[PDB]
């Protein structure tokens, strides 16, 4: 089915405790294949997948060179946003950036994402046309003019429609065993309250419903082994829709 | 791969 290559970056300002805590995480669908913790001793783009290890030097040296560029960009962006909102220097704030590209069954470009946040609130985002910007507040209008002078959208569109798609296809081929896998959830029920357990499914996109309805369902959660799990309960038929089951499953 | 070309806020 469709695939995406998201890149999540988080920088948290530490007041008086040194440089900001930057954590860069790369995702292909719901599988994390790279990571970068600035507090780690490695100071390299640590691989988080077995298939990404098949790529040797002159790739990790390039990923590392670009992820310290994200770290340096995010560390400075923390001070830019603190001055935009006129905040104190003794507080801990966060900048979150997510960019990625979606594809389809033909693995051709489908959609592009590039969003920023400050303290959990939307700051700026790339519109679906990938030419215009949706600035949230008046502080993000200053970013909009600077990013429209630099044609950042065109460069981002070049990445999102170009490099991102070609690299996702390479990732989808390097890690076809894991990235392209699909596991049907192991649905089972427990016993009043009736609860159905969707276990060990990938990707995380699942749907659980109850029909004979004020259900009690939790978020899907990582099992830790590359899979996910979920459950829903109703006080007193559990229907599950996942890519691993072409036909609906009723419990 | 990561986005090669970045820009500050």
């Amino acid at each position: 089915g469709s695939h995406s290559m998201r890149y999540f970056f988080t920088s948290v300002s530490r007041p008086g405790r040194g440089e900001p805590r930057f954590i860069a995480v790369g995702y292909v669908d719901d599988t994390q294949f790279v990571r970068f913790d600035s507090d780690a001793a490695s100071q390299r783009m640590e691989p988080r997948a077995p298939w990404i290890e098949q790529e040797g030097p002159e790739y990790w040296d390039g990923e590392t060179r670009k992820v310290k560029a994200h770290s340096q960009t995010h560390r400075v962006d923390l001070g830019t946003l603190r001055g935009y909102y006129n905040q104190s220097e003794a507080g801990s704030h966060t900048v979150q950036r997510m960019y990625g590209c979606d594809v389809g069954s033909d693995w051709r470009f489908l959609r592009g994402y590039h969003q920023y946040a400050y303290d959990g609130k939307d700051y700026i985002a790339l519109k679906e046309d990938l030419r215009s910007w949706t600035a949230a507040d008046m502080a993000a209008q200053t970013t909009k003019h600077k990013w429209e002078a630099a044609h950042v959208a065109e460069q981002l569109r070049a990445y999102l429609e170009g490099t991102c798609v070609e690299w996702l296809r390479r990732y989808l081929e390097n890690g076809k065993e894991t990235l392209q896998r699909t596991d049907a959830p192991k649905t089972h029920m427990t016993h009043a309250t009736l609860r159905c357990w969707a276990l060990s499914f990938y990707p995380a996109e699942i749907t659980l419903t109850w029909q004979r309805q004020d259900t009690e369902l939790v978020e899907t959660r990582p099992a830790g082994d590359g899979t996910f799990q979920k459950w829903a309960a109703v006080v007193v038929t559990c229907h599950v829709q996942h890519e691993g089951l072409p036909k609906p499953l009723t419990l | 791969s990561l986005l090669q070309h970045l820009i500050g806020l």
Partner: antibody, heavy 117, light 108 residues
């Protein structure tokens, strides 16, 4: 990479200043290729950069006079100043912008353009 | 544009000296400050970007710091190849703006 300017060093006043900067050791690619002039004795001034698609960000001080072009087929981007006066006499460096759009990493050797009739 | 200032204009120093060069900005430029080294007759060489990060290949004796509305370039244990002109460049808002430049001489 290696950047080399290939423009005439003598441009008549009130005439078009054409400079070409060849890129060796690589390609134009997705980098931003800037024109920076350092007049003899003074600091550096940034003219503007060109993207491979032709989208360029000019310096507003000379936006109406500067035309910057890219010839990615020949891996060279050009600068075409117009109505050039004596104030345009400078060492024109062609540079590559740093991957976070904040500095100029790779520089050309520079070319001294003299404006005199 | 954001006019850029440097302090001092010249730094007469000797080999083994510790050299400090200061830069300022008319408006807030965040930490988007780069440091360049330029020998006469040659193109500028980038040393420090984002006011703290060292460029690859630059000797570790070059250091940068930022306290607030102020930026500092430090050369601990100055060497004979470090005598040049140094520029601070802002990149918070377009256009890119450079500093006036600070020259480091061989003191005698």
């Amino acid at each position: 990479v290696q950047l080399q300017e290939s423009g005439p060093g003598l441009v008549k006043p009130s005439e078009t200043l054409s400079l070409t900067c060849t890129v060796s050791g690589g390609s134009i690619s997705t980098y931003y290729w800037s024109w920076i002039r350092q007049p003899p004795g003074k600091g550096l001034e940034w003219i503007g950069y060109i993207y491979y698609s032709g989208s360029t960000n000019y310096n507003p001080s000379l936006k109406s006079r500067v035309t910057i072009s890219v010839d990615t087929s020949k891996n060279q981007f050009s600068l075409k100043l117009s109505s050039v006066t004596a104030a345009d006499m400078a060492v024109y460096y062609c540079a590559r912008i740093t991957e976070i759009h904040d500095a100029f990493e790779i520089w050309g050797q520079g070319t001294m353009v003299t404006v005199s009739s | 544009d954001i006019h850029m200032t440097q302090s001092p204009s010249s730094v007469s120093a000797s080999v083994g000296d510790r050299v400090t060069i200061t830069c300022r900005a008319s408006q807030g430029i965040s930490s988007w400050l780069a440091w360049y080294q330029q020998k006469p007759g040659k193109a500028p060489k980038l040393l420090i970007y984002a006011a703290s990060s060292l460029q690859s290949g630059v000797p570790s004796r070059f250091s940068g710091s930022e306290s607030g509305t102020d930026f500092t370039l430090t050369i601990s244990s100055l060497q004979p190849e470090d005598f040049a002109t140094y520029y601070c460049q802002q990149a918070n808002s377009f256009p890119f703006t450079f500093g006036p430049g600070t020259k480091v001489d061989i003191k005698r």
